């Protein structure tokens, strides 16, 4: 599949991403402006908009299960529970030990039909194994879905069973940056 540009109609945040038509989950990503001098930013903002039947969602930021930073999240009542994880060998991903801070942003909304997780991921483009993503280039992201609850919903490091579905999409990171990024951080669409 291929990502495209879209706007969140309630927040006005502009993302790059996709909606999976099977589970009707939307994945969106937006990056701070590219730099002219120096290193690129290592953070981005993302969103997951999922029907409540979605019991947990994962994002594989290198587009594969193993050897890349994983984001996992689920609704626990009126709360989003989330973590950064890492996997080797196709087994239960465990707590990431690198430098990454996953922040739930105030736009996050949970209602009777959907959970909408809006997050900031600082340090998430470069991982402690030396890999990461090139925000000037084209790459692949992947998502993982389950309709079965995690083993302990109040624990961010809960174990859980393998996803019931997973999928991929191409993304042109060079067109995924926004001049309004800082405004998103202040809760402004611009």
Ligand X SMILES: *[C@@H]1O[C@H](CO)[C@@H](O[C@@H]2O[C@H](CO)[C@@H](O[C@@H]3O[C@H](CO)[C@@H](O)[C@H](O)[C@@H]3O)[C@H](O)[C@H]2NC(C)=O)[C@H](O)[C@H]1NC(C)=O
**DSSP conformation class of 175:** G
* Bridge-based pairing state of the strands 94-95 and 70-76: unpaired
- Closest contact distance (angstroms) between CB of 10 and ligand X is 5
Q: Which residue in 2, 9, 21, 77 binds ligand HEM (CB under 6 A)? A: 21
With contact defined as beta carbons under 8 Å apart, do 171 and 139 qualify?
Answer: yes
If one asks whether residue 92 binds ligand HEM (CB under 6 A), the answer comes out as yes
Contacts with a copy of itself by CB under 8 A lie at 1, 21-22, 165-168
CA-based nearest residue to 57, from 126, 149, 133, 155: 149
Token pair listed for 109: 């909304």
Which of 7-32 are b and which e, b meaning 16 or more Cβ less than 10 Å from the residue's Cβ?
A: ebeebebbbbbbebeebebbbbbbbb
> Interface mask (CB under 6 A) for ligand X, residues 126-145, using x and -?
--------------------
Q: Which residue in 58, 62, 132, 156 binds ligand HEM (CB under 6 A)? A: 58
Q: Which residue in 16, 43, 107, 116 binds ligand X (CB under 6 A)? A: 116
User: Of 86 and 181, which CB lies nearer to ligand HEM in the complex structure?
Assistant: 86
Q: Which residue in 77, 78, 90, 113 binds ligand HEM (CB under 6 A)? A: 90
User: Of 58 and 132, which CB lies nearer to ligand HEM in the complex structure?
Assistant: 58
- Closest contact distance (angstroms) between CB of 21 and ligand X is 12
- Closest contact distance (angstroms) between CB of 125 and ligand X is 27
If one asks whether residue 78 binds ligand X (CB under 6 A), the answer comes out as no
With contact defined as beta carbons under 8 Å apart, do 60 and 70 qualify?
Answer: yes
CA-based nearest residue to 82, from 127, 111, 53, 120: 120
End-to-end CA distance of the chain: 30
**Binds 99: which of a copy of itself, ligand X, ligand HEM, none (CB < 5-8 Å by kind):** none
**Binds 144: which of a copy of itself, ligand X, ligand HEM, none (CB < 5-8 Å by kind):** ligand HEM
With contact defined as beta carbons under 8 Å apart, do 136 and 171 qualify?
Answer: no
């Amino acid at each position: 599949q291929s990502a495209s540009q879209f706007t969140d109609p309630t927040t006005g945040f502009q993302f790059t991403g996709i909606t999976d038509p099977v589970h009707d989950v939307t994945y969106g990503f937006v990056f701070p402006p590219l730099a002219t001098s120096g290193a690129q930013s290592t953070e981005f903002i993302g969103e997951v908009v999922a029907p409540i039947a979605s019991k947990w969602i994962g994002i594989a930021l290198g587009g594969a299960m193993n050897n890349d930073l994983l984001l996992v999240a689920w609704a626990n009542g009126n709360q989003i529970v989330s973590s950064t994880r890492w996997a080797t060998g196709y087994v239960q991903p465990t707590a990431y030990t690198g430098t990454a801070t996953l922040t739930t942003l105030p736009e996050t909304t949970i209602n009777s039909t959907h959970w909408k997780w809006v997050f900031r991921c600082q340090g998430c483009t470069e991982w402690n194994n030396g890999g990461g993503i090139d925000v000037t280039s084209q790459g692949v992201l992947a998502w993982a879905f389950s309709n079965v609850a995690v083993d302990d919903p109040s624990d961010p490091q809960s174990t859980f069973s393998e996803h019931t579905d997973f999928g991929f999409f191409g993304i042109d990171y060079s067109t995924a940056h926004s001049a309004n990024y800082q405004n998103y951080l202040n809760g402004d669409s611009g």
